[PDB]
Each structure stands twice: as structure tokens, then as C-alpha cells.
Symmetry: C4
Subunit: 504 residues, 4 copies
């Protein structure tokens, strides 16, 4: 369109002429860093302009402005500034309107959309912004109720940061698809960090240490019940009149109850999140395993009741998975909570792509060796020779594992070539790649600790809504500001402490 | 010569005197950064000068200018500029001539020669250069047909970049001897990157995924036919009246057909490229293996037909090589395509030089131990004691593998010294060197992926010339410029999209 | 309070008005970088101010000033300067008073408190500060008695650095709780480094090399006495009339004497330091082991005398610990003294947190496998299957270690999964973490050598107080200054040499 | 002294007064950067000064000036400059004198002393210094006989660099004690690098590749003669009338001849160099081994002739050493010549200090285990249990290697503790340290290749003095300058080529 083409052309004379006589006009002008035109467009003698009018697509002026943010320091400063002048102009025209509280058709606030998009700068500013002109401090968030000097206590609005019945600032930062570029560090901002720390130290630390204790108890019960399973006859085994048998039956029913509980808590999670298959493992990997080691026990139950003795095969895998899943509860520790994150990454990246490169070698040399052997031990089987070759990779093989071969030069050449390629070369580069992975996710991922605490804190908070949803509310309904209408702004503020020396 | 000695001496008065009354005069003056003398030499009252006249060696003014480029940022800016003024002067004198289209006696254009030489700066500029003076935009390549604003769409000439019946911009960048210093990154330039990406996404992705599927099918057929080979009697085995035997014969003929196909596709490649022996492996290492694992099967065929049972020795090596060669088809993946490049480098550098350092130790201590042993088991053999010592290097040896030694202090001292030197010291430094190699070619070689896609794309494009050579042509014959003669410049342009904010 | 609120508000007019008509007034003003107010507050026409008056909490002006230091280069310069002007003002008012010699109620001097707090800048300046105004050089420490030119010899006060009957500058830097941030490098300052070097080279090198020799002799005696222990009957073994038996009895009594000596030297240390349990191992780890390997021998003695043959179990652990504790005496070497510090850190950090992550896997798969096995070898025991699984982690296991399993697919799947998770993945990331640890404490911890020499030098100095406490005093009682009272300042100075060229 | 104290005090008025009415006066003034005083002191109306007068200690003005150089960029510039003005002043006073040719009482020239001391800057300047004032170009070294332009050919004096019958510039840089700080890179200077390269490419490459071939032939002869040694009876074995026996006797006499040759070439080297014991291995480690593997064969000969059959023990070690010493001849290759330097460093630093830390553990746990075992196999021996424990460190041990122990908890606890401490912890930190060592001497030591070529080139040049000492002289006796006396300076110059563009 020409009327917007001229605006995008940085033309002021034509803009004024059109006034006399982002796809929206205001949004299109704003996104181009004209700035002064925004004020000129906002009000004009020929006709005024309105920002409250939402776009057909659903993005208002604020949504459009945050849309263009591309996480650049200069870009961050520009966008946050121009956002501030847009808010100031809106206040000047009519302070009654609440632009930020206004939302798109999809129910996303500018703060929530900034969080989901991953715009760290805009979210950081909006979360904490202090206005000094008292007549214009209504729409400020980071206050300074009292600064004694060395310490300058501050108050943060935290309206939709915690108590929000919609997508909140933390929910989006911890329950999203995890493709956002800076979710890892984006919750180190001023209010969120201390809010989550307070939540944990006050209300969630016990409810988590309790869950770990109950899980350990459940796993001990399950191990004891599985270890002492009857071995005579076919299931179901009729109860016997012994204290041990009844006590074991209690253990078994506890095991099955836990299994069904985990199955349902997994199914409800997968209906709540609807994770994409391509991102099924990357995002929620600690949630797939708790579901699978309950699927195993459900299969075990159905096999056990249907006159079958293969249920042990299922139950044993469930037991091993249940024990090895106690690394999900190390997220509550910084020092030891990074080992559960190294295994997760190495099993999915370093050990998943490297298996294709290895099974090729193993199968090639296995077929070679097995065809070389006449069989005229029973080593002619492909499985047996594929297992004898695997032992070489873990340093407990034996060169002379067969003699049915007619040719001794060729067989030993093949075996030595395999040993050199896999034991000495492939292993020593897989280990090198694991070195790089450990480097990375031990030097930069030291705050996946914080991210995992955010996820578990939100999970527990959602869990205990029935117990205390409104009561378990962070922050105090304190008075820090006054509205233009004359009412007192009672905001759910969160006290904060900070110190600075050089400023004096 | 004095007339050129004065020019090389930065003398202007003597140059003017000589005018009144790089080995070429114009080229010699140009290479010295006189610049103004180039204009002065080009035309003069006493007599004019011509640039179209090719030198006796074969380098014109443009070839000579690109010759001196030494890949320096300041040098790159200087050479590209002075190249631009040479083109402008040539246009001013007579726009009819086409200097760049002009070539040397060897058929190399300035762009092609710049590509082969490895001059990244000159090639980058010439590939994309935009002229703003409309009267002088004839010899421009990177146009801006329309810039809407945030997006500024561009057009690239791409005359000899793809559809060239001569050494093209991509052919030289992907089918050369690979001694060029920046071939790895040199195809990240504006037009080439997106041209190759479009070629792959449109026309080559299927033709490659088809080849990998057919190779997997061929290898499965070959493995099945080799695994179920008859073991009774001597070859050739007469066909039996069984479904299995006939089906196996079909498999065998497919195997031999594939073998001969690979043999011929290797021989034709080695006659097409004529690779130097010193660079036989460095450049085309994935091409030697496909040839060798076909030589093995041809040897197997000739042995099989000539009443011989050692053909199994050849066929087994062919089978193992064929299976392990499926890492050639991982070039089409970024994540897993770097494991095929780590093996290639480590087998040729880290594991080839380190074997000399190890066979010395193995042979020294083997001879020592074998002479120490009287034999008064049959361990006196040099092979047996060289194998017993090798097991120590891969952690499955045994100290007391013999007792024929008269001296127990000396034999155990030798064995412990060998174990400490090879198992604990040589292995743990070979692994460290592999660490450095993996570091390098996992941090910088992440675009050998792109380079290998360039090679395979060119290979497939040459393969399907009969199917669609002219039809499978990239770019559209679009109108972006006008020649001085008045004809419309219909150029095989390639649309491109780009965005910039700060410029405004 | 308002009178101090105004001061903290950087108000000068109100300060002057209050004068006319850190919690202390002077300290509160000083900590805020008013500086000029300190001089104004010190003396005033309306009323003067005194700094000698100690605060109720116990911090004087100097203690308060050093309290605010936060180890910042600009902060260090500011605090050291303002400290210097406070000293100068105190001298001007009345040079008779000795502020620095003055101490708090807890017996801490400003230097000692600066050392304990970890303030490197303040301690570095106070230790070496040179005054050029001769009338004001009384309270200087780093003198220049004579500077020949290229060499400028210097004298350092070293009053409480060595000969202090209180918490001294070295004692605090080497016998504290080790939570101080820069104790590692904080004793590289001018006087302390050369003082400790002189102490070692003169008086302590022999007394330490003697102790190592005596410990080696004691361990050889103990090993010989334990190796040739009687094996017939039950203890106590009655002495026999043989030279060997009597000589062994002498060895045994020497062993027990050494054991009781170590027990008491450990108990007295733990009553001297009162280390917190949370820091029991981090701080004094080389002191726990010498105590434990004496507790073992005391338990061995009490078992031996009370008609018991399990004393061998205790004595053997004591012997192994005593031999492996000879790495405590490698602190006296730079090159080999870093291996005793790598083991200390890796056993407490890399191998302590990683065991939890491993015992989970071992126990999970052990329970899985043992429940899978019917036992219908005696491998049903949990211990046997937990040991068979452990061998896999150290590369000497065997896949087919049992056959009592009914299901062969499941058992081998479990075994291969365990081998891949623990042998190939957990080990290769524990080794990577050990790589980072070794990197760190081999590149930065190369002065834990110096720190350990400081600790051992102080230990030996305290040990030999009875031999020569006053006589073994560092520095000479030399004359470098004169007091205002007219007496000659005979200070225990330590000569030092230094060279500078550029200053000229 | 006062007359020099004033000079060291930067006093000019007192210096002038003393004139009217480094320990030497001129040297003392020069070393202090007075500069102008040097000219003032050199000549004065009251009395002149002379620089040719050598000091009592033996350092002249030039030696004293180079003495103070401390390898600092600003210091290097200052010292080289002031050296140049001293030379210019000496020329002005009387060009007849040759100060640089003048030497101290010990026979060291300023260039030679600068080389030995390790002063890179002074040596670099003196080796190549160009003077432009033609009247003052006599004492210049780096000439420019003709500069065509892009290429500026240069001539270098190289008087004592190669043909010097005294300590030369290369001899000192390659046959010194190796404690010099920058010997590694100090021979990358302009003339030395190309001089050594020319020497190798022309005269030494063959004489070295010949020596390696002859050594390989000698080792093959020795291996063949030792492998087929008679086994019947006692030595000396009387010759038998067989072709094989006579041919073996020829091999044996060749072996002994080579052994005695190596013994004498080692003894003469150790009398030529007189290496200090503390630096016996650091400096010449490739020279100790060739001597030791000849001592072994001499011991073998003396045992063989004196009716003894233990000569095999000596000869076998000699054979193993001779084979493993072929890594001395990899210095002539860049790519593979760094493996012989990694072994040299790791055997002396990483594996020598780490053995003390390991033998402590091995002996402690060996004594513990052996005393724990009653023996009521023959595992009670200390050697057997020390070997069974060592196998654990190289991953081929066995937990249940004995059953004579009464206590099974304690024995297995000890074994597991040993395995965890040594196999899993000590090995994985020794490997980490080897990682650092390989990092270093593979990233910075890539020119120990050049240094070793320098040493071998000098060795071969000294070897072939009888063949062609004067004839095998580098450089041409060319004319580049003229002396003040009028004679033509025919200097043994070495042509050199260089190119520069930016200077123009
Ligand atoms: Na093994
Ligand atoms: Na191993």
C-alpha cells in the first residue's frame, strides 16, 4: 500500500500530507524507528489516532513493538525506550486505559508474549521499570519504597508473575516447548529469581523432600516384594497362610498402586502438554521414563493375571527403571544435580548418533567373519559371532574364539582390523566427544539446576492448589502507588534488597 | 627492463617522459598500486594503450590483477577496488568489449581463476557487486530489483556459476585438488550457498536418498547371497533344482553386477581426475574405498571361476568393506555426517604416523622376548610372541604366558617394561592426540558437511545430464538490466532475500 | 537516627548545623566516602571528636574502615587512602596514641582482622607502606634504609607478622577455617613470602626432612613387625626365647608407641581448632587420616589384648593407611606435592558425588538381575550379583556368568544395558570431570604448595617453642626510625632486596 | 665509590666536575641509560676516555652493555640502540679498531656471549643490522646489495655464524646446557634459519638418511644373529662347519663392532660436553640411551667370553633398546618427529614423579593384604601379591585370587579400595596430566624439530671435517662493502630473498 509505503520510506512530508488528507498503520510506523511520527500519528489536527484498537491479526501496538525485538543490545535499548514513550503517550492521552492489561484474542499479555517469544531484554525491562516523575509513576513496576542508603530496598509489582489465572511469567518460562533461545538464563531476572527462591525455601522444599522419601520407600517396598516372589507353579499364586506371604501381598498391592498412579500422572501430563513427537524426548525426558516404567508394570500385571510367567520379564525392567529413575530427584541439589543432566544429554546425542556409526562396523565384520567360518561351538550363528565381536569393544574378548575357519591369515586379519577400528579408534573418539559434551553442560548448564527447580516448583504449586491456592500466594498486598482516579494501588508486591557503593 | 624498472620505482615524471617518447606494461604498473598511472597509461596524447591485448604468458590485465591478490583484508579491499576502476575505465573507453567474458589461452575466466587460486575476497566481490550509477550498471552482478524496506530482495547474475560448459564457479570449488586454503568456507558466499541449498532441496535430495536406499538393498542382497554360499565341493558350484539355490544365484549375479559397476565408476573417476599419488588419499578418500571393495569382489569372481576356494577370503573382505562404506552416505546429515569425517582424518593422520612409533616397540620387545626364550606351547615362533604382546596393548594379555624361559627376573622385567611403555603410555598419548584431532574437526569442520554436499550435488547433476541437463537449470531468465547497445539483458538470475535494520 | 541519616544523605550544611548544635558517628561518616567530613568531624569549633573511643560492638574507626572493604581495585585504593589520611590525622592531633596497636575487645588488631576477613588490598598496603615526609614516617612499615640504585634495599616492620603472642598475620592466614576467598594467593605479599622462605631455608627444612625420615623408619618397623606376626594360637602371644621374637616385640612396641602418639597429636589438634563438622574434611583432610590410622591401631591393641583374633583386621587397615599417608610429606616438594592435593580433591568432590549416581545403577540392575534369576553357583545372593556387576565396570566381567535364568533375551538385554550405561557412559564422564578437576588444581593450585609450607612451618615453629622460641626469631632489631617522643624505634625488621629499571 | 656513585645518581654537574678534575666507569655510566654521558665521557677537554681497554673481570663496554639486557621489548630497543651509538662513536674516534671482533679473556665475542646468555633481541639485531649512511656502513651485517622492488635481496655477513674456529653462533645455540630461556625459538632469526635450511637441503640430508639406513641394517643384522644363537652347551660356542654358523658369526662380529663404536662415541661425547648430573637427562636424553644399549652389549660380550650363560639377559635388553632407539632418527621429520619428543618428556616428568605416588599405594596395600593372609598357591610371598595387585591397575586382575584369608569382608574391602584408588582414580589423573603435557609439547614444541635438526646438522658437520671442512663452507666470499683503509670487504655473505608490499 502507498500510504504505508511512504511511512516505510522514512518520508515525513508525505506522512503529513496524508494525515491532512506490523501491518497496522501505527504499528508499521512504530516498527521502523520513526518514533516522532508515532507521536505525530497519535494526535493530529486533521484527525487523531487510537492505539487501543486491536489489529485484525490480533497484535496491538505493544504486541507489534515486542514482536520486532530481536535480542540485540542496541535493539533492546531502542525497543524498551520506544515502549516507554508509547506507554507515556497513552497515559498522557487518557490514563484510564490499561494497555498492558489489554490482551490479544489469544489471551497473551505483552509480558506473557515477550516471555514466550524469548525476548529477554523487553521482559527484563517490563518486569523491573522505575519511573521518577511522580505524576507518571502509575504504570511503574520496580518501586523503591525506601532506600536507607547503602541498602536501597525495592518493591516489584508481580501481578501476573505468580498469581495469574492465565499463562503467567513463570509458567511460560518453565512449561513451554523449550525451543526458546534463552530460557536457561532468562529467569535470572530481578523479581523471578528471588520469587522462586522464596517459594522453594518456604513452601516447596519440604513437599519435594517428602516426595523423594516416599519414592524411596515405594522402591524399597517394590524391590522387597519382587525379590521374594513365589517360584512354584504358575500365576496367579494363591495366597498362603503365612505372615511373610500376606506381608508380600501388601507390598505387591502397593507396587501396583504406585504403577497405576505413575501411569495416570503420565497420561494426564501428555494430554496437558501435547508434546510434539520431534520434541518428545528433548523437552520432557524425565517424564517419559516415569511413564515407561509404569507401562512395564501394567504389562506385568496383565501378564500375571492371564496365567503367564513372562510377567517377570516385564517386572524386572520396571524394577531396574524405577531404581535408575531416582536421578530425577537430584534436581534439588546443585552439586549432584548435574549428573542427571549429563546422562540425559549423552544418551540422546553422544550415544544415539554414535550407535549408527558402530552397528555398521559390528554388522559388517560380523557378517564377514560368519561367512568366513565353515562350521565344519556352534559359532555359525550370527548372534553368537555378533556377541563375540562386541566383547572386543569392551576389552574382554579373545582372538582365538573359534577354529572352524579354514583360513587363519584372513580370519585374524579381520579380527585385528575390527579390534583396531572399534576398540582403539571408535571408542577413543566417542570418549572425546563425551568430553566436549561434559565440558559444555558442566560449564554453561550449571543453571539447568535453577530451571529444573522452576519446573518442579510450578508442578508442586499446581499440585497443592486444593490445599492452599490463594493462601499459598507470594508477596504482600502493599501500598506503593496511587492511581489517577484517586484509588490507592494495593499491589501484590515482593520486597527486595540491593546495595550499591560507587553511585553514592 | 628500464621502461618497466622506472614504473616499478614509483616514478611519474619518467613514466610521462616515456609515454611522450605481471610482466606486461599495463599489468606491471597495475600490480604496484600506482592506480592513477593505469588511467594515465590507458589513454595518452602521445599514444593510447589497450587492455584487451592478452599477454604472451596468457594473463590479461584482469588475470594479472587477480594474480597478485594474497587474501589480506586491506589487500582484498585494494584489489577489488582497483579491479572496479579497471572495469569502469574499460566501459568508458568502449563498453562493447567484454573483458570478464574474455579468457586466457587455457580457458579460465577471471572468476574461474580466482576460484581455483583460492582468492576468497576477489571471488566474493565479483560474485556480488552492485553499481548505483545507472549508466554504468551493465557489468554489475548483484542487483536489487525491488527493496520493499525491511526486506531488500536481490538478484544475482549466476551466469557461469551453474550453467557453464567449462570450469564453473562450483566445479572448481568442489572438484579441484583441495590444496586451496579456504575451499572449506569459500562456498558460504551469497549466491553459491543459496544456489546449492535450492538445488538440494528441489532436485537432488531425492536422487541421493534413493541411492542410499539402493545401496542398502544391494548390501543386504550381497550379505544374504554370501552367507548362504554352498560349502560342499569346489567352485564353480553347479546350480541345483531348489528355490533357495536359484534365489541365491539371483543374489550372486546382483552382487557381481554391483561390483563391476563400482569398479567402472571408480576407473572412470580416476581417469577423469588424474589425482596425484601424493594426494591420492587426502583428496578422494571416500572414492578409493568404493573402488577397492569392488576390486576385492572382482578378484573373488576370477578366483571362484578358476576352480579355487580362496575366493571366500576375497569376498569376505569385500563384504566387510561394503558394510563399513555406508558411512559415505552420512554426508547428507549434519549431526551424524561428522563421524565419517573424523574416521577419515584419524585413520590417515593420528593412526598412520602412530603405528610406526608402535611397531618399533612391538618388534623390539618381541625379538627380545623370543630370543630370551629357549623353548627347551611352541611360543618360540615370532608371530605367536608378537601376538601375545599385542594383547597386552588392548588389555587382555597375561603375564605368565610362557615358562620356557630360564631367567624369570629378566623376562618379567621385559614384560612389565613393555606393558608400561605401550599400554599405559603410548595408548594414553595416542588418545590425547585423537582428542586434539576431534577438537579441531568437530569445531571447525562443521562445514565439511556443506562441502561434501557441494561435491555430491555436482556429482548427481553431472549424472542426470541425459535426463534433464538444460531443463534442470537453476535460476530464471529474468530482466534486470539493459546493455549499451539497447538490447535487454536477460540474465539467468537467482532471487534472494535479505533484511537489515540499523541502516534504515 | 536523624543525626546519622543526614550524614548518610551526603548533607554538609546539616552536618555543620548539627556540629554547631558502621553504627558510630565517625565510623558512619567515614564508611560513606565523605572523607572531608572525617576531618571536619575530627575537630570543630563547637566541639571536637575522638577516634580512640572504641564502639560498643567493639569496632573502632580503623576496624570499621577495614570492615567495609570489599576487595575491589577502586575500593581497595579508596579504603587504603582514607585509612592513610585517618592515620595522618590521628598523628597530627596527638602522635602519642597508637591506634593500630589498639585492638577490639576480642583481641584483634586491624592487621589481624584484615587478614582473617580476607581483605587482600588493605593487608597488602598496611604490611608495606612507605612515607616520604620524614616528620610523618613514624607509623610507616616498609622502609628504604638504603637504595644504591638498580637495587633499592627495603626494611619491613614485621612486628606482629612472626613474633606475636596473639593471632598473628601468618597464623590467621594459615590456621583459620579456610573459607577466606584469597588465602591461596594472599601470602604472596612482599614481607610474608620472603619471611616464610627464610624460615624454611634456615630453620625448618631440616626439622621437616627429619620427620619424614623418622616416619619412613616407623612405617618400615611397623610393616616388619606386622608381616612376621605369630600365626599359632590366640593372642596375646607369649614371648619366645628367640632373637627374632624379641626383635619383633621391640618392633611391636615401637608401632604401638607411634600409634598412641598420633592419636594424641590428633586429639589435641581437634581440641585446639574445634573444626566444624561441615568443614571437618574440606579444611583439615591430611589431619583426619593420621588420626584414623591411629584409631585403627588402638582398636587393634584393645582387640589383641582381649583374647581376639580380629585385631589383624584392624591392624591391616592401619598398615595400609600408614603407607598411603606418606603423601602428606610431599608438601615439601613443588613438582610432586600437587599429586597429594589432586587425590584430596578428587576423593572428596569427583568421586564422592559420583558414587551416589553409580550405586543407584548398580543396585537397580543388581535387584533386577537377581529377581530375574530363579536359581532352579549360588548366584541368587544379592552380594554375588552385585559383585559380578561391578567387575563389568572395571572391564573384567563376563556376560555368561550364570545360566539359572529362564529368559535369555531379557537377561542379556539387562546385562548389555548395564554395561553400556556404566562401563561406556558413566566412567567416561567421571573421567571427563576428573579432567576438569585436574585442569583447575594443576593450573591454579600450584601455590597450595606455598600454603601447605606455611601451615607446616607454623606447625614446626609451634612445636619447637621449648627448644628455641625467642632465639628462633626472624628479623633483626634494627634502627630505621625515630619516635616523636625522641626514643629510637628499634624494630624487628626484615631486610629485602628489589630492583627496578624503568623508573630511573 | 663516590665517583661512580654520582654517575649512578644521574648527576651531570658532578660528572662534569669530576671530568674536569658494570664496575668500570664507562660501563657503569652506560648501563644506567645516561647515553649522553657516554659521549661526554668518551671524549672531554680535561681528558679523553677509551673503550678498547678491557675490564679486569673481562667484560668490555660491549660485553657490559649486552650483560644488562633482560629480554624486554623496550629494554631490547634501548640496548640495541645504545649499542649502535657506541659502535658509531667508536668508528668516529678511530674506525681502525674492531671492537666486536675484540673478545674477553675467555674467548667470547659479543655475539657469542649474547647467544650463550640467551639475549634474543641483541643477537637478532647484531646478526641483521643495516646502515644507510654509506660512510658508516663498514660495521653493518645485513646488506641490501640489490632490491628490484617487490623483492629486496639481502646479504648477511655470517662471519662467525658458521665458519668460526671458536664458539660460533650455532654451536652455542645448539650445543650448550639448554638452560637458556629461548633456545627453542632463538634460531628462527633471519640468517640462521635459512643457513641451516640450506645446509640440510644441500650437504646433510643424505649423510643423515644414510646413517638411518645403516642403523636399520645394523639392527636387522643384530636381530638375526641374536635370534639364531646356539642353545646347546655353554659359551663360547665353537664355530661349526656350516654356512649358517659362519654367516651368524659374521653377524655377531658386526653386532659387537657396532656396540663398541657406540660405546666410544658416547664416552667421547661425555668427555666433550662434561654434562652436569642434575642435567644429565634433561639435555642429552637421546645420547644416554645409545650409550646404555652399548654398555649392555659390552657386558654381554664379557659374560659370553667368561663361560657364562647370563649374557643372554644382557644381550636381550640391548636388542630391545636398539630397536626402540630408532625413534632418535625421527628428528628428520616434522610430522612424526614429535612422537620421539613426547616420549622423552613423559618418561621423565609425567611418569617419573607419578611412580612415587603409585609405589606408595601398591606397597601399602600389598603389605596389608599379605599380612592379612595366613597361608594356612603360595601367595604369602610379597612379590606374588605385589604382582597380583599390579594386574588390577592394568585391568586384567581378579578379585578372588586367593582363599587363604580368614576374613572375607576385610580382604575384599581392601581389594576394592585399592582398585578404586589406583585403577579408577590414579590412572585417570595420570592420563589427564599426560593430556596437559601432550597439549604443551604438541602446540609449542613444534620447533624442537628445528632445534634437533640444528643439533644433528652441527654433529654431521663436525663429523665430516676431514672429508671437507673448508670446502663444505656456506656462503660466497662476495663484495658488499669497503673498509676505511681502502681495502675491499670480501665477506662470506649468504644471499637472501624477501618481499614487502605495504611499504612501497
Ligand atoms: Na579386560
Ligand atoms: Na580398559
Amino acid at each position: 500500500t502507498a500510504l504505508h509505503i511512504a511511512i516505510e520510506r522514512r518520508n515525513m512530508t508525505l506522512v503529513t500530507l496524508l494525515v491532512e488528507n506490523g501491518e497496522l498503520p501505527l504499528s508499521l510506523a512504530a516498527c521502523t524507528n520513526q518514533l516522532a511520527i508515532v507521536k505525530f500519528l497519535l494526535q493530529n489536527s486533521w484527525q487523531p489516532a487510537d492505539i487501543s484498537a486491536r489489529d485484525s491479526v490480533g497484535n496491538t501496538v505493544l504486541h507489534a513493538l515486542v514482536e520486532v525485538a530481536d535480542n540485540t543490545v542496541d535493539n533492546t535499548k531502542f525497543v524498551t525506550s520506544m515502549y516507554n514513550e508509547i506507554l507515556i503517550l497513552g497515559a498522557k492521552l487518557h490514563p484510564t486505559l490499561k494497555l498492558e492489561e489489554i490482551t490479544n484474542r489469544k489471551g497473551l499479555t505483552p509480558l506473557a508474549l515477550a516471555a514466550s517469544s524469548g525476548k529477554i531484554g523487553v521482559l527484563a525491562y517490563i518486569l523491573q521499570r522505575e519511573i521518577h516523575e511522580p505524576e507518571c509513576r502509575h504504570l511503574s513496576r520496580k518501586f523503591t519504597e525506601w532506600a536507607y542508603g547503602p541498602v536501597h530496598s525495592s518493591l516489584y509489582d508481580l501481578s501476573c508473575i505468580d498469581t495469574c489465572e492465565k499463562n503467567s511469567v513463570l509458567e511460560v518460562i518453565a512449561y513451554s516447548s523449550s525451543e526458546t533461545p534463552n530460557r536457561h538464563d532468562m529467569l535470572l531476572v530481578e523479581p523471578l529469581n528471588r520469587l522462586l527462591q522464596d517459594k522453594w525455601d518456604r513452601f516447596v522444599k519440604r513437599i519435594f523432600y517428602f516426595n523423594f522419601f516416599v519414592y524411596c520407600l515405594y522402591m524399597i517396598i517394590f524391590t522387597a516384594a519382587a525379590y521374594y516372589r513365589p517360584v512354584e507353579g504358575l500365576p496367579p499364586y494363591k495366597l498362603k497362610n503365612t505372615v511373610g506371604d500376606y506381608f508380600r501381598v501388601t507390598g505387591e498391592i502397593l507396587s501396583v498402586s504406585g504403577g497405576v498412579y505413575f501411569f495416570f500422572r503420565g497420561i494426564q501430563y501428555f494430554l496437558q502438554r501435547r508434546p510434539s513427537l520431534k520434541s518428545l524426548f528433548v523437552d520432557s525426558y524425565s517424564e517419559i521414563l516415569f511413564f515407561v516404567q509404569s507401562l512395564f508394570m501394567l504389562v506385568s500385571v496383565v501378564l500375571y493375571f492371564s496365567q503367564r510367567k513372562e510377567y517377570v520379564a516385564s517386572m524386572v525392567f520396571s524394577l531396574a527403571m524405577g531404581w535408575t529413575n531416582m536421578l530425577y530427584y537430584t534436581r534439588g541439589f546443585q552439586q549432584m544435580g548435574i549428573y542427571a543432566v549429563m546422562i540425559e544429554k549423552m544418551i540422546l546425542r553422544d550415544l544415539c548418533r554414535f550407535m549408527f556409526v558402530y552397528l555398521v562396523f559390528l554388522f559388517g565384520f560380523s557378517t564377514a567373519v560368519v561367512t568366513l567360518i565353515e562350521d565344519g561351538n556352534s559359532y555359525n550363528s550370527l548372534y553368537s559371532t555378533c556377541l563375540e565381536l562386541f566383547k572386543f569393544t569392551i576389552g574382554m574378548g579373545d582372538l582365538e574364539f573359534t577354529e572352524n575357519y579354514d583360513f587363519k591369515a584372513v580370519f585374524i586379519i579381520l579380527l585385528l582390523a575390527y579390534v583396531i577400528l572399534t576398540y582403539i579408534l571408535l571408542l577413543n573418539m566417542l570418549i572425546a566427544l563425551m568430553g566436549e559434551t561434559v565440558n559444555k553442560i558442566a560449564q554453561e548448564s550449571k543453571n539447568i539446576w535453577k530451571l529444573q527447580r522452576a519446573i518442579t516448583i510450578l508442578d508442586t504449586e499446581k499440585s497443592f492448589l486444593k490445599c492452599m491456592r490463594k493462601a499459598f500466594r507470594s508477596g504482600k498486598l502493599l501500598q506503593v502507588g496511587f492511581t489517577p482516579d484517586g484509588k490507592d494501588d494495593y499491589r501484590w508486591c515482593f520486597r527486595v534488597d540491593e546495595v550499591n557503593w560507587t553511585t553514592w
